[PDB]
Design a protein around this ligand. Sequence first.
Ligand SMILES: CC(C)(C)[C@H](NC(=O)C(F)(F)F)C(=O)N1C[C@H]2[C@@H]([C@H]1C(=O)N[C@H](C=N)CC1CCNC1=O)C2(C)C
Ligand SMILES: CC(C)(C)[C@H](NC(=O)C(F)(F)F)C(=O)N1C[C@H]2[C@@H]([C@H]1C(=O)N[C@H](C=N)CC1CCNC1=O)C2(C)C
Ligand SMILES: [Cl-]
Ligand SMILES: [Cl-]
Ligand SMILES: [Cl-]
Ligand SMILES: [Cl-]
Ligand SMILES: [Cl-]
Ligand SMILES: [Cl-]
Ligand SMILES: [Cl-]
Ligand SMILES: [Cl-]
Ligand code: NA
Ligand code: NA
Ligand code: NA
Ligand code: NA
Ligand code: NA
Ligand code: NA
Ligand code: NA
Ligand code: NA
Ligand code: NA
Ligand code: NA
Lengths: 305, 305
Amino acid sequence: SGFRKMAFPSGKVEGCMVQVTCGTTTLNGLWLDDVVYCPRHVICTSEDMFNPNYEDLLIRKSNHNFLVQAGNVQLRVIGHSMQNCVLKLKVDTANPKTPKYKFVRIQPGQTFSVLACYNGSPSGVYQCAMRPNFTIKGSFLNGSCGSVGFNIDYDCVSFCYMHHMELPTGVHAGTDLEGNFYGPFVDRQTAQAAGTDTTITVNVLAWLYAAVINGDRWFLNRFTTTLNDFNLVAMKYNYEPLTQDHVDILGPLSAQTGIAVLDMCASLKELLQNGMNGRTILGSALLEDEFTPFDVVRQCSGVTF
Amino acid sequence: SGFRKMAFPSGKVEGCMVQVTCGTTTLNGLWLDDVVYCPRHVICTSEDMFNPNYEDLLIRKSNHNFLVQAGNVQLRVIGHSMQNCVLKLKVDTANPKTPKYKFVRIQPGQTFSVLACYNGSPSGVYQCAMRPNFTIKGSFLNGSCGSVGFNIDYDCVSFCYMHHMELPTGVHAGTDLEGNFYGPFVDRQTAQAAGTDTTITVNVLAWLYAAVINGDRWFLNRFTTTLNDFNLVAMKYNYEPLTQDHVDILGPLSAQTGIAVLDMCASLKELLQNGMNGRTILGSALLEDEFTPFDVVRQCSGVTF
Ligand SMILES: CC(C)(C)[C@H](NC(=O)C(F)(F)F)C(=O)N1C[C@H]2[C@@H]([C@H]1C(=O)N[C@H](C=N)CC1CCNC1=O)C2(C)C
Ligand SMILES: CC(C)(C)[C@H](NC(=O)C(F)(F)F)C(=O)N1C[C@H]2[C@@H]([C@H]1C(=O)N[C@H](C=N)CC1CCNC1=O)C2(C)C
Ligand SMILES: [Cl-]
Ligand SMILES: [Cl-]
Ligand SMILES: [Cl-]
Ligand SMILES: [Cl-]
Ligand SMILES: [Cl-]
Ligand SMILES: [Cl-]
Ligand SMILES: [Cl-]
Ligand SMILES: [Cl-]
Ligand code: NA
Ligand code: NA
Ligand code: NA
Ligand code: NA
Ligand code: NA
Ligand code: NA
Ligand code: NA
Ligand code: NA
Ligand code: NA
Ligand code: NA
């Protein structure tokens, strides 16, 4: 028993982390096969990052201008190109530790593990969730760029995020592994603001199922409700509208616990209108919305990789 | 910026995880050099675990009775012995992925990363803290035994915990890598209860420093206090007595933030007597005591491994 913010094992991702240095800027790169993916502002100086012309800054750069280091071995760059906000550095040696992988673009509310790195070396791993405002809350410092977000399915590592910048409210923004930003953000040091964030409703319900699985049951009531009646109350508390797709995704958890999804919605409805009354759930005095239904099943059933 | 429950990169530990099967019981083992460490109740049946005689159960076992699998390769066992509550299975092949490591016995209040495994395969990683009652809150299911807790210093992996059992209150107990249990617990299915747990005071203060580092400052006041005056108030809220050693350990954080330790104690004193007044700290409405001062510095300064 027990429930924890559990990240995926980062071993497969650690074997692909490299150091990328262009001039005086040093960032992290993702070494898959014979290509190194890294944020495109590695070619920027401190003054370039205000109004950067990445196309122009890349013309004045040759292959030898990119210093890629895998541990104590320097990777010879034999090609380079730019795909949106990421550079593709072609090296003459393929990474032997390249795991089976895929490039995916996750949806808001979905979670992933972040392997925070500096100078091509991993510092730690934690769990994150793509907020509905297309930002992620993170733990990133300068030099963390190129660190990636990921999910693991059996032997396949699905890369879904690459860090790029931090917003004034302390949250972080980045792109997918094709350089496409999550949200209306751009990689330049100007005034940028994240939109109003909302609470991921389907993840809150999944977190309530984990609580029931682990013995936390005081919030359960004999009432039921309709999807329309629940969304009318949740919308006033800045909660995500619960769709039929979310109910179908919560099916596996509802079947294992024996609690209908609309029953759990009736419990969440009471929790939003009356609070927690000095009580906690899984040791937390606040509702938790960064646990997908799969995160609950994977943790409570022991899915391995 | 940002602060998160961050675990160490588990890559070095994943390369040592193996599957250990004795009869019908399958657990996890730690493959370091040519020795596999695993919990000693792998030789137990379901009925043996009530009043087990591990010495007697081991006499009736030969080397070939232990089935060790590293991925798709079976490791031939050429020796076996028991050290307290752990078995040392000597194999004929040394693990090439053996990292620089050490066996340490951590103190209450210190943290580590748990690589939860099943059938020798990693399921996830999370951060844990050795509670003052010598239990750890965890996320373990049946088959999780042999999973280990660890800390990383540069290139050295310090193994400090091995999972064994779960207590009735949902918490978990285990041993060090020499088979010595943490606390007065034994590896048998009988009535066992964890003592009254307390809040790790020095870790709460370290968590308050991380909050100040990340902009959370509403709880700061102009008051100061003495170590004697703070411990008199904290003792009534079931907090750990703050010692001079704890103040010296918080030195690095106090110097970086420019806030004296006794000043932070004056803030914590007010927080314990008056609550949080509907406010949060680092998004949390409860005080956090599983972040050592080193965990704060390592995360907020980007220490890599
Ligand atoms: C935070 C700062 C106000 C400086 C700025 N923010 C905005 O410009 C915004 F407001 F538009 F977001 C910003 O992050 N950057 C300016 C510039 C890059 C980037 C950057 O330094 N990346 C770091 C690389 N290691 C990761 C860091 C550092 C701090 N926190 C992180 O996460 C680019 C957008 C090209
Ligand atoms: C939880 C149970 C009431 C069954 C019992 N607890 C107590 O006997 C106590 F109350 F004394 F703690 C207990 O855990 N065990 C009985 C027996 C071992 C062990 C065990 O099953 N280990 C599992 C191995 N994969 C890890 C698990 C399983 C569930 N939760 C975990 O963490 C031994 C102590 C030899
Ligand atoms: Cl956690
Ligand atoms: Cl840097
Ligand atoms: Cl129930
Ligand atoms: Cl009541
Ligand atoms: Cl977290
Ligand atoms: Cl099992
Ligand atoms: Cl301040
Ligand atoms: Cl006020
Ligand atoms: Na629990
Ligand atoms: Na200009
Ligand atoms: Na591929
Ligand atoms: Na600003
Ligand atoms: Na149930
Ligand atoms: Na913050
Ligand atoms: Na008997
Ligand atoms: Na050694
Ligand atoms: Na019991
Ligand atoms: Na300060």
